[PDB]
């Protein structure tokens, strides 16, 4: 109840079946709530998919009713999502959330006509594509102090040619957070993604401190820890 987390394939071939699961931690699935699924295609709005009760009753979006099935696994404190006959228009970021109970009648107390979703997951990216998963190649970007302020330098990591989205970057196992700027990816003409992550550090530390970028690419189950040293 306190936290929800999605987990899925990341890539689905056309006409395949999207399969997702939301693990509920900190609370029980048998609560009087409607466990919901929401998606948002790239550059578009929010779209409600469906919901399920802890007894198994469901309610679906009429435009997706013919392709969706939402289940609840009381033995694992989870609820899942299935979406078949996928196409390119099903590429989106999918969220699991929790909605309150309500009344469809006309004589309930006032607090039964609200609707909202106050507990959300972190979301997961699913891209419907016929291409294959490609892990990243990480190269260091040696320090440069010309574009920064007095007594600082800029060093970074280049994450080249991966598919699909996304990748996350951290520095020194999260111990280095000030001055970090990860830029959004570029879609190269080859269909592969690439981005860079730069961090600003004191130029007086370039010879004494170790700088390592931690690149994580979940769709390929790959993690790289690249050391960045001066020229």
């Amino acid at each position: 109840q306190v936290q929800l987390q999605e987990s899925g394939p990341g890539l689905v071939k056309p006409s395949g079946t999207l399969s997702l699961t939301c693990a509920v931690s900190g609370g029980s699935i048998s609560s009087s709530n409607w466990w919901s699924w929401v998606r948002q295609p790239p550059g578009k709005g929010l779209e409600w998919i469906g919901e399920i009760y802890h007894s198994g009753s469901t309610n679906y979006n009429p435009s997706l009713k013919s392709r969706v099935t939402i289940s609840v696994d009381k033995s694992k404190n989870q609820f899942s999502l299935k979406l078949s006959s996928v196409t390119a228009a099903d590429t989106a970021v999918y969220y699991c959330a929790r909605a309150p109970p309500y009344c469809s009648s006309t004589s309930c107390p006032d607090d039964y006509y609200y609707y909202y979703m106050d507990v959300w997951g972190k979301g997961t990216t699913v891209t419907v594509s016929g291409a294959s998963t490609k892990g990243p190649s990480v190269f260091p970007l040696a320090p440069s102090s010309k574009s920064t302020s007095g007594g600082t330098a800029a060093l970074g990591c280049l994450v080249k040619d991966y598919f699909p989205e996304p990748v996350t970057v951290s520095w020194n196992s999260g111990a280095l957070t000030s001055g970090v700027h990860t830029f959004p990816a570029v879609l190269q003409s080859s269909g592969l993604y690439s981005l860079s992550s730069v961090v600003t550090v004191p130029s007086s530390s370039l010879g004494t401190q170790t700088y390592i970028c931690n690149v994580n690419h979940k769709p390929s189950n790959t993690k790289v820890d690249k050391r960045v040293e001066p020229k």
């Binding site: 919901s36 709005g45 929010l46 779209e47 409600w48 919901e51 309610n59 679906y60 979006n61 009429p62 969220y95 909605a99 309500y102 469809s104 006509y113 609200y114 609707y115 909202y116 979703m117 106050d118 959300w120 972190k122 979301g123 190269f139 260091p140 970007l141 040696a142 440069s144 010309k146 574009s147 800029a154 970074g156 280049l158 080249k160 700027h181 830029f183 959004p184 990816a185 570029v186 879609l187 190269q188 003409s189 690439s194 981005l195 860079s196 730069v198």
Partner: protein, 210 residues
């Protein structure tokens, strides 16, 4: 189906009213969400005029008949985001419907020149018989920019990949451009240049093989 305005603008310190219209709103209350680029939606209004903890009281909600309104009194820069209304349908088995969204622009924010950083290819990539030039652009406002590449003193135009501007956490914008070359091309020229132009002014950074 709930209807919103696709774009609304407000000046710093003034009041704005975002409307949400739908026949279902006669039966169920309307909730509101705020979403900034690259983040998940955040609940700001449960319904009526009830807000979660952490939401500043400059946000307020109301509804009457078939319409609902989110009101932001005294808009600040951190209120620049998208806003979605959300409720429950009144027909059938009551599915959940969303509004199309409203992109809220805040006027009067300060301008800013782009900060440019250009990295040459690394020794590891060259040894792998590849070469990438990385031009990183950040902190420019407004979010329009043009990037041009130069081999020595000549335009190249081939092998260039540039991203569209995206909004940073400080409402300024960032972008990046990549030039892919062969190791032979990198060593057969004396320099390459990344030229970034913004609001009529240009910043030029140059790298050289060494």
């Amino acid at each position: 189906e709930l209807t919103q305005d696709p774009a609304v603008s407000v000046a710093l310190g003034q009041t704005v009213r975002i409307t949400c219209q739908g026949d279902s709103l006669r039966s169920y209350y309307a909730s509101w969400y705020q979403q900034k680029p690259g983040q998940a939606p955040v609940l700001v209004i449960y319904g009526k005029n009830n807000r979660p903890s952490g939401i500043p009281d400059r946000f307020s909600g109301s509804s009457s008949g078939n319409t609902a309104s989110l009101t932001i009194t005294g808009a600040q820069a951190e209120d620049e985001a998208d806003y979605y209304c959300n409720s429950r349908d009144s027909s059938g088995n009551h599915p959940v419907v969303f509004g199309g969204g409203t992109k809220l622009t805040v006027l009067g924010q300060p301008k800013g020149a782009p900060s440019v950083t250009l990295f040459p290819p690394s020794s590891e990539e060259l040894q792998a018989n590849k070469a990438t030039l990385v031009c990183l652009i950040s902190d420019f406002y407004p979010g329009a920019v043009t990037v041009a590449w130069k081999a020595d003193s000549s335009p190249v135009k081939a092998g260039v990949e540039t991203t569209t501007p995206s909004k940073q956490s400080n409402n300024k914008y960032a972008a990046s451009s990549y030039l892919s070359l062969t190791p032979e091309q990198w060593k057969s020229h004396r320099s390459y240049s990344c030229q970034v132009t913004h609001e009529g002014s240009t910043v030029e950074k140059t790298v050289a093989p060494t």
